[PDB]
Design a binder for this molecule. Sequence first.
Ligand code: MN3
Ligand code: MN3
Lengths: 492, 492
Amino acid sequence: RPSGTYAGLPIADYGDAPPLSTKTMFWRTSPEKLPPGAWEPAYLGSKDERVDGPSLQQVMRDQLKPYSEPRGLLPPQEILDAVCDAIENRLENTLEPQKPWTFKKACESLDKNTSSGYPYHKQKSKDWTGSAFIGDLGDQATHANNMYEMGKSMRPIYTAALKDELVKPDKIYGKIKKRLLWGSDLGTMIRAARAFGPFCDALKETCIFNPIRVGMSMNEDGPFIFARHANFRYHMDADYTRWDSTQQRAILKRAGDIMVRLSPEPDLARVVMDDLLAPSLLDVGDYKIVVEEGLPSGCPCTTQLNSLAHWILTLCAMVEVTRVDPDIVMQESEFSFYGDDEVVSTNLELDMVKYTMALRRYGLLPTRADKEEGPLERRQTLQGISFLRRAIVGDQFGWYGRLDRASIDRQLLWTKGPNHQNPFETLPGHAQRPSQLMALLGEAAMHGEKYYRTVASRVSKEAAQSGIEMVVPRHRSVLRWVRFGTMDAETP
Amino acid sequence: RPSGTYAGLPIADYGDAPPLSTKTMFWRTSPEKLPPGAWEPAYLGSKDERVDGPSLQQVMRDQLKPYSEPRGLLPPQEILDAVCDAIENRLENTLEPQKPWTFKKACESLDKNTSSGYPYHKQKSKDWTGSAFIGDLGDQATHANNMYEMGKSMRPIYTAALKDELVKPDKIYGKIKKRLLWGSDLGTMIRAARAFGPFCDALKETCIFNPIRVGMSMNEDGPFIFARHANFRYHMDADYTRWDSTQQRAILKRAGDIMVRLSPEPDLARVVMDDLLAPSLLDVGDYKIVVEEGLPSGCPCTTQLNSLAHWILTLCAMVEVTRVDPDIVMQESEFSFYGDDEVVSTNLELDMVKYTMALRRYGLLPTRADKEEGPLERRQTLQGISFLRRAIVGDQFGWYGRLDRASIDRQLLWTKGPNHQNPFETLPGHAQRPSQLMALLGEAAMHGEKYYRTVASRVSKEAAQSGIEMVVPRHRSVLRWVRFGTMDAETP
Ligand SMILES: [Mn+3]
Ligand SMILES: [Mn+3]
C-alpha cells in the first residue's frame, strides 16, 4: 500500500462497500403518460428499463474525475489572512459560547434513518435503543468516543453513493449523470458531532444575523433574511458548477481553523478536524481510493465547514477586486451561504469582470444565467434570484421565498415511497400525503387565483383516489396562512 | 341638563371623581444633589415643596383647552374613502379571522392594578377572585356584559387624571405642565374588550407585517421592523404636538368603522364603538363635562383606534400630495404607528412643503426637529430617527432600537416605589431592582466600552448599597446578549 489506480486516483485498499443502489424512492402519482420534457428519477443502472446506459460503477467513475483535476490558486496570503481574521472576529462577536457535547448528545443528534457506513453499512436505528447504541454500532461508537476523549487520531472511511433524485430528462436519455455522495462512517460521525455540535448550534441560533443560513426556516426566516439583503444596492448569484469537487483543502483548513478555535474543546476538536481534512479514503466498492483534494462532504458538520469556506472565498474575491478591507465589505454587504448556494448583496461598486476572473483563478466555476461565456452579471433588484431552491419574491407585505410552478408540478407528479425498480409504477397504497398536499396548496396560493385553482383540482383528485378526505380551503385563506400564518402547524 | 361651563366646555352633571393625586411613584436612588437641568417627577400641586404653583385643578384646566379649539378640515372625501378602503383591504388580506371573546376572557384581559373608574374608583384587583369579578365590580361587569349581549347602548363615563412621570425641569419651575389621562369606566372596559379584543389580537400577531406596532418587542421585533423601513429611500417623523386633543371624531369614526367591520361580532361591536365615539362625559372632580371632539383615550383598545386614525391621516396627506393611489403608496412605503408615534419611509418623491400644509390643514400640529417654523424635513438615512422612545441604530449586524445616554442616566437617578409626597426622599428599602439593572446594563453596552464601564460602576454601587449581589459581566458578553441573545430571559 498504496499502489494502483482507479478512476484516476490512487488505490489504498480493497473495498467493503455494498453494491450501488439500483432502485428509486419516487413513484408516479398516476398511470397517465408523463408530460414531454418532464423530470424523472435519476438513472438506475443496467436494470433500468428506460435506457441502455453504462454501469452505475462507470457513472461513478465519471463523477470522480474533477478530484484529480489540478487545483486552482490560493487567494493572496495577506487577503486570505485578513478575511479569515474578520470572519473569526464576526463570529466571536455574535456566537453564544456553548458547553461541550456529551457522548449521549452526539449520539442523539445523528440521523438514525441513514447508514452507519463503514464497516457495518447498517441503518443506524437497527442498533439504537432510543437513547444509546448497542451491538456492533455500540462497539464502534464507544471506541470512537474513547479515541475522542484521549485526543487520539482515527482515519475516516467514506462510502460512495449516487443520489436518488429527480433530474432533467437529458441526464437520463442523453449524457447520463448522477450525483456523488459521501457516506461518512459512524466513528467519524460521533467524533465530528461531539467536537463541532456546539459550534453548529451556536451558528444555527445566529442564522439570521450571520451569512451561514443552515437551520433557517424559509417561511419563518426568509422574510427577514431577504429584507436584510434588500437593504443593499447590488445583488448576484455566481451559480457554481461542481462546487464540492473544486475545493482546496488549504481553504477548507482555514475554515476548519475557525471552527476549532470557536469550539468549547479546541484541543480535542483539532484532532478531529485534522482527521477530516487529511487525504480521504473513499470506498467505491472494489477499492478504497485516496482523495487528496475537494470537499469530504460526509459528516454532520460538513455543510457548515463548506459554507465557511464559501464565505472565505467570496470575501477574498471581493476584497481582492474592490480593495476594501474584509470587515468594511461586511458592513457594506449581506451574504447568504448554504454549502455551494449563495446570494451576495452589496453597496460596493464591484467590477464583475475582475470578480469573475478572481473566482476562476481560485479554481471555481461560476456560471452566467444564460450559460454563455463572459462575466457574471449583477442586478439592482433581488426579484429573480433564488436561494434554497425557492425564488425570492417581494410585494407590499414584504419579501419571501416561493417555489416555482415547475417544482410544484413536479411534486404533484411524483411521491416518495419504499425503494423499487420501476419509477413509472403507481404506489398502490391509496397514498396519504396530507401534510405535503397542504404545503403544496400553500406554495400554489402564492402564485395567484388562476394557478391555485388548477393545483387545487389536482390536489383534490389525488386526495379523492386516496384514503383521507380533507377540506380544500379558499385561495385567500391559504394565502394568508402561508405568508403570515400565526404559526406553521395545521391548516388555515 | 346640560347647562354651565367648566374649562371652556359644557357641564353635564356633578362630579364623582376622587381628588387628583398629590403624590409620585419616583424615588431618588441617592441623597446626592441632582445634576443641573435634570428631569424630575411632574408637579404635585399645592403641597409640592419644590415650587409654589397653581392647583392641580387649574393645571388640568390648562390641559382641557385644546378640546374647545376649532377642529381642522376633513381630508377630501374621495381620498378619505380611497385610503379607508385600501387600509381595510390590507387588513382583510393579513388578519387571521378570530373567534368572539367570552365575558370571562374580556375580564381576564383587563389590567387589575389600575382603577375601575366610575362609579367605584377602586383598584380592579380588590374585587377580583382570580377568574371573575365579585362584589361591586361584579355587579358593574355583569350588567355591562348583559347590555353588550343585548346590543344595548351605555353612556361611557371617563375620569380625568394627570400623569406621574419624569419631565424636563422647565415644566416644573417655568410654565407648569402635566399630561391629561382619561380613565375609562369598568363597564365600558368590559364592553370594549369583548367587542374589540379579537381585532386587537389579530393585529398584534401581525405587528411586523402591518404598520400598527402595538404589541411589538423592541429587542425581538425592532431589528426586522427597522430593516423593512431601511428598504425605502426617504425617512421622516412628523413629531406631533397634542395629537390626541387635535383628533376629529369623524376621522375616528372611519377608524372605528374598520375595527367594527373586521370584528367577529360586527353588530354588537357597532353599539360599543358608537358609544365610544359619541360626545364623551369626562369627570374632572366637581363636574362631568361634555367633550365632543378629540380622542377619548380611556380604553383597552384605544391605542389601536388611534394608530388606525393616524394611518388614515398619513395616507390621506401622502395621497393628496403625491397623487398616487393609497394602495400603491403602501407598496412604495413602510409605516410604523403607535398612537401618535410614527416613522414613515417611502420611495415616493414627496413635496415636504405641500405635505406639511396638508397635515396642518387637517388640524394636526407636526413639528420640525429644530422646533422652528417651516416644512417637515426628510432624510435618506434612518439613523437619527426614534420610535417607542428608542433611537434607531444600524451597524454591520443589522438595525435595532437603543435607549439614549440621557434616558439611561435618568433610570439610574430614579426608581419606582410606593406613592409619596417628596420626590427627593430615598427609598430606604435597600431597593432591589435586579431585572431592571440588568436591562440597563444591556442598554449601556450598546453604547460602547467607555460608556458601559461608567454605567457598570453606578450599577454596582446601586447593587452594593442594596440587598442582593449579582455578577457584573464583561462588556462583550452583555452586548452579545442584548443584540443577539438566544432569548431575553436571565443574564448572559
Ligand atoms: Mn443558488
Ligand atoms: Mn416619535
